[PDB]
Design a binder for this molecule. Structure first.
Ligand SMILES: *[C@@H]1O[C@H](CO[C@H]2O[C@@H](C)[C@@H](O)[C@@H](O)[C@@H]2O)[C@@H](O[C@@H]2O[C@H](CO)[C@@H](O[C@@H]3O[C@H](CO[C@@H]4O[C@H](CO)[C@@H](O)[C@H](O)[C@@H]4O)[C@@H](O)[C@H](O[C@@H]4O[C@H](CO)[C@@H](O)[C@H](O)[C@@H]4O)[C@@H]3O)[C@H](O)[C@H]2NC(C)=O)[C@H](O)[C@H]1NC(C)=O
Ligand SMILES: *[C@@H]1O[C@H](CO[C@H]2O[C@@H](C)[C@@H](O)[C@@H](O)[C@@H]2O)[C@@H](O[C@@H]2O[C@H](CO)[C@@H](O[C@H]3O[C@H](CO)[C@@H](O)[C@H](O)[C@@H]3O)[C@H](O)[C@H]2NC(C)=O)[C@H](O)[C@H]1NC(C)=O
Ligand SMILES: *[C@@H]1O[C@H](CO[C@H]2O[C@@H](C)[C@@H](O)[C@@H](O)[C@@H]2O)[C@@H](O)[C@H](O)[C@H]1NC(C)=O
Ligand SMILES: *[C@@H]1O[C@H](CO)[C@@H](O)[C@H](O)[C@H]1NC(C)=O
Lengths: 392, 392
């Protein structure tokens, strides 16, 4: 009964005739399902974690200059040269500074000079490439047991992983059997014109082209260190208007500027490996092998006293909690729906075939009452439990 | 002789008649001045440091969240509340989450919820406000002694501070007297429509209006800690689409984005407190009480041997270094300019009244030879020194 108490909750009907029941599992969503002589299921879609990815490019957003070296020749004696002009960890720019007797050159004129700066990237962006057959949605299916605490507990689920190519698999629900599902991963983002850009614990999804266009020093992705940052000119600058000495200057973090830019793009909020993509996944459940929780049970012959005051959910159902003051042991719970007097049936039951498993464990049931006045009859003849109800 | 070797160098002539000489001292500049029977000065404008400033406001560019606290009531039981909502250190937002039996509220419906977060600023900007009558320009005046090392040494000068309201002040040059200057600081930036915005070791100067408009958490300037950051929401964001829990999230450093935004703005090189401003300061020096280095000397009667090969400066002068193999002691240096034969004077002498102070200290002299062929005659009769020269 996980879905119990979830805002976005879909109730799917069994279609009296056949078994299969197609669904639509979506993030922030949940779906209760029910069928004729079939348990009521609460199928949810937990995550849309992409398995392994391939990192394409790798942008730098925080540069730190180190080991500044320089060399300078006099007038009429060619440019200077540092071996650092050939290293790639180093960015260098030549320039011309006044030179005379004063500063060591017996000749007067514009001398030559070159400066270099070892570049080390602190923080950086990784632009990843994900595609269709790379995703593994995890479905959690909690059967309506009626268990004492089962009411809206996102824990009790029966886990099932459904990949793009293992498209149809089956879950084994304790004492219910096996639920086969036939899902088909459709996605409203073409993972062919989109890059999964990471950055610290976060992650977006943008255009290949755009991502590539960003003004940022990069290094075609690869693990275990020491890059050769390309285009370090977009973060490292050189100034020298007075022609005296040349100042080196990094640009400071682009984290902020990137967030600001990543406005309209959809977020993904990375979890430290896995990710939550919005993916409206459509299946079709096979009720076949899925058996029920014993029709071979007798009807309970005693009383049910309402342990927790009944409540209405955000959709138009009730949740009854009752304790059996019997001794019947395993037995069905007599559910008789009254239209105010006792002539017909207007409201139906959600928790299919509610049972008392142990005299000592309270039983939760969820029903869908009629409109306006309605009376319930949980039990039999002798002091049978009555709950009058007003709907709408 | 500091100026000697400076690219942008200005030769200001005496205007034969009176004493005063107006000049124009500028960053990146240097001016050699000269007059009749007056020493040749080398006025330069060192720094344009603004004395004491007041911080108007103070924006924050990097936020760090801490001690996250929250409180949430059931449905139909009003919003939740925290004592932190009243704290200025905490930024808080209310929102609504699904509530049911499961998560502790016997009633079903949308619950109330408030979350808070102790905001703390790591790095922050300072917007100061300077106004003309605040700053002290520092002029360095080196006289052309002709001293052994003085050739372009930016050390030997005679310091002078000229403030906006200390408009005219005088400097004592050793063995030359006193030079008076009547400066009038003019600047091409209205320090009334601009704020000097610092940021780490850097600093620019932008429009008050713009500065304030910046999307940043501020705290009207004040020293010795513990701010009450105003409008913290411009860095802190809150998420809650699924209505389960509320996520706290900062925006990361704006350093980059700021630099990025500070493009057109003119820079100032804030160096440990004091700063450099582009200021074309215009003076007028009084040559009056500025005497010269003894006309009371006799002419040197021996030989001078060129100690360092003479060289042409970036403008069109020459720098003569010579040793006096004499014994005359303190004496003038007979400077005769030849037009190629000995009929007239085409070239002058920049280094005024060149003198040898000690037989054992070389003397440097700067002269301005005629165009084309020219011959120099330093000394008298006996093997006197000659330097053939070709100009243009
Ligand atoms: C820019 O200016 C600086 C300062 O110039 C000062 O010079 C004074 C003479 C005086 O006019 C001041 O008013 C003026 O401001 C220059 O500096 C000077 O550097 C020189 C060169 O290094 C220092 O000269 C001394 O040289 C001594 C001998 O070294 C030999 O010289 C022989 C020449 O006969 C030569 O044949 C040899 O081959 C060898 O090179 C050396 O022994 C001195 O050491 C000093 O020892 C005394 C103790 O007696 C100490 O008190 C002193 O501090 C030294 O340790 C010197 O090295 C001179 O000291 C420096 N002067 C000062 C105080 O700064 C600078 O060079 C110049 N820049 C340029 C244009 O190159
Ligand atoms: C949400 O559900 C969990 C787990 O609910 C479990 O209940 C038992 C009765 C089984 O039906 C099981 O399949 C189901 O998953 C609730 O947490 C706690 O569960 C404990 C049972 O494991 C329970 O009792 C104690 O005794 C058992 C052994 O018999 C022991 O394993 C436990 O550690 C525990 O000591 C305990 O009462 C229950 N928690 C509390 C304090 O009530 C959880 O309570 C549910 N949340 C809600 C809606 O309150
Ligand atoms: C904020 O917490 C400060 C540190 O207390 C920590 O104690 C740990 C045991 C754990 O509970 C953490 O969550 C706490 O942060 C504490 O010293 C301050 O008093 C707290 N309040 C302020 C000033 O923010
Ligand atoms: C650069 O300087 C560091 C110390 O700052 C030194 O360890 C290193 O040898 C120098 N050369 C390199 C590798 O850049």
């Amino acid at each position: 009964m996980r879905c119990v108490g979830v805002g976005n909750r879909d109730f799917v009907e069994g279609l009296s005739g056949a078994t299969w029941v197609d669904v639509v599992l979506e993030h922030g969503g949940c779906v209760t399902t029910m069928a004729k002589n079939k348990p009521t299921l609460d199928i949810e879609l937990q995550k849309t974690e992409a398995t392994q990815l391939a990192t394409l490019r790798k942008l730098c957003i925080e540069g730190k200059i180190t080991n500044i070296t320089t060399d300078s020749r006099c007038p009429t004696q060619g440019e200077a040269i540092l071996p650092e002009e050939q290293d790639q960890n180093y960015v260098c720019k030549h320039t011309y500074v006044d030179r005379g007797w004063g500063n060591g050159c017996g000749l007067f004129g514009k001398g030559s000079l070159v400066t270099c700066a070892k570049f080390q990237c602190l923080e950086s962006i990784e632009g990843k490439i994900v595609q269709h057959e790379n995703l593994k949605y995890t479905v959690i299916i909690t059967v309506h047991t009626g268990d004492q605490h089962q009411v809206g507990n996102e824990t009790q689920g029966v886990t099932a992983e459904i990949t793009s190519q293992a498209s149809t698999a089956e879950a084994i629900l304790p004492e219910y059997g096996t639920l086969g599902l036939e899902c088909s991963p459709r996605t409203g983002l073409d993972f062919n014109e989109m890059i999964l850009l990471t950055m610290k614990d976060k992650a977006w999804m943008v255009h290949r082209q755009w991502f590539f266009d960003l003004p940022l020093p990069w290094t075609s992705g690869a693990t275990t260190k020491t890059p050769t940052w390309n285009r370090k000119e977009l973060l490292v600058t050189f100034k020298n208007a007075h022609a005296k000495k040349q100042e080196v200057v990094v640009l400071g973090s682009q984290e902020g500027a990137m967030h600001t830019a990543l406005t309209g793009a959809t977020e993904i909020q990375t979890s430290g490996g896995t990710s939550i993509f919005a993916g409206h996944l459509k299946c079709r459940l096979k009720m076949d092998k899925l058996k029920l929780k014993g029709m071979s049970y007798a009807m309970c012959l005693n009383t049910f006293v309402l342990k927790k005051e009944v409540s209405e959910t955000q959709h138009g159902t009730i949740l009854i909690k009752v304790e059996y003051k019997g001794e019947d042991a395993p037995c069905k719970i007599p559910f008789s729906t009254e239209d105010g007097q006792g002539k017909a049936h207007n409201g139906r039951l959600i928790t299919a075939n509610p049972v008392v498993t142990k005299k000592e464990e309270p039983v939760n049931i969820e029903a869908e009452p009629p409109f306006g006045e309605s009376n319930i009859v949980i039990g039999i003849g002798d002091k049978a439990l009555k709950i009058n109800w007003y709907r709408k």
